[PDB]
Amino acid sequence: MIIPVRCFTCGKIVGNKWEAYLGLLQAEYTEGDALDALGLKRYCCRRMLLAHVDLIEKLLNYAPL
Amino acid sequence: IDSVAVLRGIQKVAMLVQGNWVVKSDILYPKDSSSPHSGVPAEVLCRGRD
Amino acid sequence: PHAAKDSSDPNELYVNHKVYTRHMTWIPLGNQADLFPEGTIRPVHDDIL
Ligand SMILES: [Zn+2]
């Protein structure tokens, strides 16, 4: 639904690195170099950001409002 | 088919960009249509594509 | 109250549509206000969605 705050395995704070990640995708950056620039060294946080699907806005499209 | 008639037809549905022909925005987005992703009116989509 | 006619992006249409952790406000109890200088007690990252 939404990006988890913490990485599941290690526990590094990953919730605050989501929208900026999207900015790097809004820029010309690839996935790997954007993850490197965000500072995700070990592959668990890279899996956290890379494999996350942002369903929150799609659900909000069905929100009452 | 004669080239002049084809040119006349394509000038009414396409524009010239770098020597190629790109379909006009209004052709892709009719006045009753809207963005499938955001639902904005087709006029805004036409302006953005222009 | 002031936005463009289209405003496809939610940022222009809406305000406070993303609840960042900077919206958290510390509420002192007792004498904690005196003991802790302002700005010491806060969420660490300030940008968590
Ligand atoms: Zn991790």
mmCIF file of C-alpha atoms and ligand atoms in Angstrom:
data_model
loop_
_atom_site.group_PDB
_atom_site.id
_atom_site.type_symbol
_atom_site.label_atom_id
_atom_site.label_comp_id
_atom_site.label_asym_id
_atom_site.label_seq_id
_atom_site.Cartn_x
_atom_site.Cartn_y
_atom_site.Cartn_z
ATOM 1 C CA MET A 1 0.000 0.000 0.000
ATOM 2 C CA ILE A 2 2.626 2.507 1.154
ATOM 3 C CA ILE A 3 6.410 2.427 1.477
ATOM 4 C CA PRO A 4 7.484 0.796 4.772
ATOM 5 C CA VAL A 5 9.316 3.062 7.194
ATOM 6 C CA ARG A 6 12.041 0.538 8.070
ATOM 7 C CA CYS A 7 13.900 -2.033 6.022
ATOM 8 C CA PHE A 8 12.664 -5.494 6.982
ATOM 9 C CA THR A 9 16.025 -7.231 7.464
ATOM 10 C CA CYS A 10 18.614 -4.660 8.545
ATOM 11 C CA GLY A 11 16.312 -1.924 9.848
ATOM 12 C CA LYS A 12 17.762 1.116 8.073
ATOM 13 C CA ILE A 13 15.346 4.027 7.726
ATOM 14 C CA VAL A 14 14.031 3.718 4.165
ATOM 15 C CA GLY A 15 10.664 5.508 4.401
ATOM 16 C CA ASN A 16 12.155 8.967 3.895
ATOM 17 C CA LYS A 17 14.082 7.892 0.765
ATOM 18 C CA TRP A 18 11.024 7.021 -1.342
ATOM 19 C CA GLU A 19 9.837 10.297 -2.879
ATOM 20 C CA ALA A 20 13.401 11.483 -3.514
ATOM 21 C CA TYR A 21 13.955 8.147 -5.260
ATOM 22 C CA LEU A 22 11.010 9.002 -7.507
ATOM 23 C CA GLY A 23 12.704 12.315 -8.239
ATOM 24 C CA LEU A 24 15.765 10.422 -9.435
ATOM 25 C CA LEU A 25 13.396 8.461 -11.666
ATOM 26 C CA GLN A 26 11.769 11.741 -12.696
ATOM 27 C CA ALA A 27 15.338 12.681 -13.616
ATOM 28 C CA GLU A 28 17.440 10.637 -16.041
ATOM 29 C CA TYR A 29 18.885 8.261 -13.431
ATOM 30 C CA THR A 30 18.704 4.493 -13.867
ATOM 31 C CA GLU A 31 17.517 2.262 -11.019
ATOM 32 C CA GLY A 32 20.959 1.079 -9.916
ATOM 33 C CA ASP A 33 22.743 4.422 -9.894
ATOM 34 C CA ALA A 34 19.765 6.117 -8.227
ATOM 35 C CA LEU A 35 19.895 3.488 -5.476
ATOM 36 C CA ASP A 36 23.646 4.060 -5.170
ATOM 37 C CA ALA A 37 23.140 7.830 -4.908
ATOM 38 C CA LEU A 38 20.485 7.323 -2.224
ATOM 39 C CA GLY A 39 23.113 5.517 -0.138
ATOM 40 C CA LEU A 40 21.625 1.996 -0.107
ATOM 41 C CA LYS A 41 24.757 -0.148 0.002
ATOM 42 C CA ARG A 42 23.519 -3.574 1.109
ATOM 43 C CA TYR A 43 21.040 -5.209 -1.250
ATOM 44 C CA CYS A 44 18.202 -5.508 1.296
ATOM 45 C CA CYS A 45 17.354 -1.791 1.201
ATOM 46 C CA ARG A 46 17.778 -1.876 -2.581
ATOM 47 C CA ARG A 47 15.195 -4.671 -2.631
ATOM 48 C CA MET A 48 12.992 -2.595 -0.314
ATOM 49 C CA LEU A 49 12.915 0.431 -2.620
ATOM 50 C CA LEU A 50 13.161 -1.408 -5.959
ATOM 51 C CA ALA A 51 10.404 -3.983 -5.345
ATOM 52 C CA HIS A 52 7.963 -1.603 -3.625
ATOM 53 C CA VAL A 53 4.751 -0.734 -5.475
ATOM 54 C CA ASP A 54 3.072 2.588 -4.667
ATOM 55 C CA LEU A 55 -0.577 1.585 -4.298
ATOM 56 C CA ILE A 56 -1.453 4.487 -1.989
ATOM 57 C CA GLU A 57 -2.285 6.967 -4.766
ATOM 58 C CA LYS A 58 -4.270 4.389 -6.744
ATOM 59 C CA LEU A 59 -6.297 3.662 -3.600
ATOM 60 C CA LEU A 60 -6.667 7.401 -2.919
ATOM 61 C CA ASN A 61 -8.210 7.714 -6.379
ATOM 62 C CA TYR A 62 -11.053 5.673 -4.828
ATOM 63 C CA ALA A 63 -11.076 7.665 -1.580
ATOM 64 C CA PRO A 64 -14.288 9.479 -0.548
ATOM 65 C CA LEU A 65 -12.878 13.020 -0.859
ATOM 66 C CA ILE B 1 -2.280 7.208 -55.046
ATOM 67 C CA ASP B 2 -0.928 10.606 -56.068
ATOM 68 C CA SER B 3 1.538 12.216 -53.668
ATOM 69 C CA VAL B 4 -0.198 15.622 -53.658
ATOM 70 C CA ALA B 5 -3.469 14.172 -52.346
ATOM 71 C CA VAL B 6 -1.612 12.252 -49.622
ATOM 72 C CA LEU B 7 0.240 15.435 -48.643
ATOM 73 C CA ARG B 8 -3.045 17.365 -48.494
ATOM 74 C CA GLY B 9 -4.600 14.682 -46.300
ATOM 75 C CA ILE B 10 -1.633 14.415 -43.946
ATOM 76 C CA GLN B 11 -1.402 18.204 -43.533
ATOM 77 C CA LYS B 12 -4.899 18.139 -41.958
ATOM 78 C CA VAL B 13 -4.133 15.407 -39.389
ATOM 79 C CA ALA B 14 -0.390 15.811 -38.763
ATOM 80 C CA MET B 15 2.369 18.351 -38.146
ATOM 81 C CA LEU B 16 5.970 18.443 -39.350
ATOM 82 C CA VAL B 17 8.682 17.891 -36.723
ATOM 83 C CA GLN B 18 12.294 17.448 -37.902
ATOM 84 C CA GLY B 19 11.096 16.324 -41.321
ATOM 85 C CA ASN B 20 8.742 13.665 -39.923
ATOM 86 C CA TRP B 21 4.974 13.728 -39.430
ATOM 87 C CA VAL B 22 3.383 13.553 -35.975
ATOM 88 C CA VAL B 23 -0.368 13.154 -35.526
ATOM 89 C CA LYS B 24 -2.155 16.193 -34.127
ATOM 90 C CA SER B 25 -3.048 16.191 -30.441
ATOM 91 C CA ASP B 26 -6.782 16.713 -31.014
ATOM 92 C CA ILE B 27 -6.883 13.609 -33.227
ATOM 93 C CA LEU B 28 -5.540 11.461 -30.384
ATOM 94 C CA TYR B 29 -7.717 13.192 -27.762
ATOM 95 C CA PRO B 30 -11.286 14.027 -28.853
ATOM 96 C CA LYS B 31 -13.026 16.901 -27.102
ATOM 97 C CA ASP B 32 -15.125 14.443 -25.060
ATOM 98 C CA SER B 33 -12.113 12.359 -24.008
ATOM 99 C CA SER B 34 -9.988 12.663 -20.874
ATOM 100 C CA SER B 35 -6.660 11.406 -19.583
ATOM 101 C CA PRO B 36 -6.961 7.703 -18.645
ATOM 102 C CA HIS B 37 -4.432 8.264 -15.842
ATOM 103 C CA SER B 38 -5.537 11.607 -14.352
ATOM 104 C CA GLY B 39 -8.948 12.381 -15.872
ATOM 105 C CA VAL B 40 -7.949 15.919 -16.906
ATOM 106 C CA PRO B 41 -9.911 17.384 -19.848
ATOM 107 C CA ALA B 42 -8.568 16.676 -23.328
ATOM 108 C CA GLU B 43 -7.794 20.373 -23.900
ATOM 109 C CA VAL B 44 -5.002 20.264 -21.305
ATOM 110 C CA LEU B 45 -3.619 17.086 -22.878
ATOM 111 C CA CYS B 46 -3.659 18.781 -26.284
ATOM 112 C CA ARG B 47 -1.821 21.812 -24.879
ATOM 113 C CA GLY B 48 0.801 19.618 -23.219
ATOM 114 C CA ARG B 49 1.389 17.519 -26.329
ATOM 115 C CA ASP B 50 1.612 20.695 -28.425
ATOM 116 C CA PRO C 1 -7.658 27.896 -2.732
ATOM 117 C CA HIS C 2 -5.327 29.066 -5.536
ATOM 118 C CA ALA C 3 -4.387 26.552 -8.225
ATOM 119 C CA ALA C 4 -4.231 26.219 -11.990
ATOM 120 C CA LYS C 5 -7.247 25.092 -13.996
ATOM 121 C CA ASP C 6 -5.704 21.694 -14.788
ATOM 122 C CA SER C 7 -3.308 21.104 -11.854
ATOM 123 C CA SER C 8 -2.745 17.436 -12.643
ATOM 124 C CA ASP C 9 -0.056 17.105 -9.976
ATOM 125 C CA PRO C 10 -1.479 16.634 -6.445
ATOM 126 C CA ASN C 11 1.088 19.109 -5.081
ATOM 127 C CA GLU C 12 -0.614 22.095 -6.727
ATOM 128 C CA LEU C 13 -4.181 20.896 -6.090
ATOM 129 C CA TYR C 14 -3.762 19.942 -2.439
ATOM 130 C CA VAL C 15 -2.065 21.097 0.751
ATOM 131 C CA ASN C 16 -0.915 18.749 3.535
ATOM 132 C CA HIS C 17 -1.723 15.788 1.277
ATOM 133 C CA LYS C 18 1.512 14.105 2.441
ATOM 134 C CA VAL C 19 1.750 13.733 6.228
ATOM 135 C CA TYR C 20 5.484 14.014 6.777
ATOM 136 C CA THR C 21 6.965 13.364 10.201
ATOM 137 C CA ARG C 22 7.879 17.054 10.541
ATOM 138 C CA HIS C 23 4.208 17.692 11.357
ATOM 139 C CA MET C 24 4.816 15.956 14.695
ATOM 140 C CA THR C 25 4.926 18.554 17.473
ATOM 141 C CA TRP C 26 6.407 17.779 20.879
ATOM 142 C CA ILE C 27 4.026 18.475 23.764
ATOM 143 C CA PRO C 28 6.051 19.039 26.962
ATOM 144 C CA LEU C 29 4.854 17.463 30.200
ATOM 145 C CA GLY C 30 5.620 19.024 33.566
ATOM 146 C CA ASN C 31 9.074 20.616 33.504
ATOM 147 C CA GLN C 32 10.356 18.830 30.380
ATOM 148 C CA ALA C 33 10.172 22.164 28.538
ATOM 149 C CA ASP C 34 12.806 23.660 30.852
ATOM 150 C CA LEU C 35 15.045 20.576 30.944
ATOM 151 C CA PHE C 36 15.149 20.104 27.157
ATOM 152 C CA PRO C 37 16.011 23.127 24.988
ATOM 153 C CA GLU C 38 13.680 23.706 22.058
ATOM 154 C CA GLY C 39 14.453 21.544 19.037
ATOM 155 C CA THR C 40 16.176 18.774 21.004
ATOM 156 C CA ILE C 41 13.075 16.549 21.193
ATOM 157 C CA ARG C 42 11.879 15.756 17.665
ATOM 158 C CA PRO C 43 11.686 12.936 15.113
ATOM 159 C CA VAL C 44 15.170 12.102 13.901
ATOM 160 C CA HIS C 45 14.792 12.153 10.122
ATOM 161 C CA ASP C 46 12.164 14.931 9.672
ATOM 162 C CA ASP C 47 11.235 13.594 6.195
ATOM 163 C CA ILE C 48 9.643 10.165 6.770
ATOM 164 C CA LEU C 49 6.379 9.808 4.843
HETATM 165 ZN ZN ZN D 1 18.172 -2.906 4.689
#
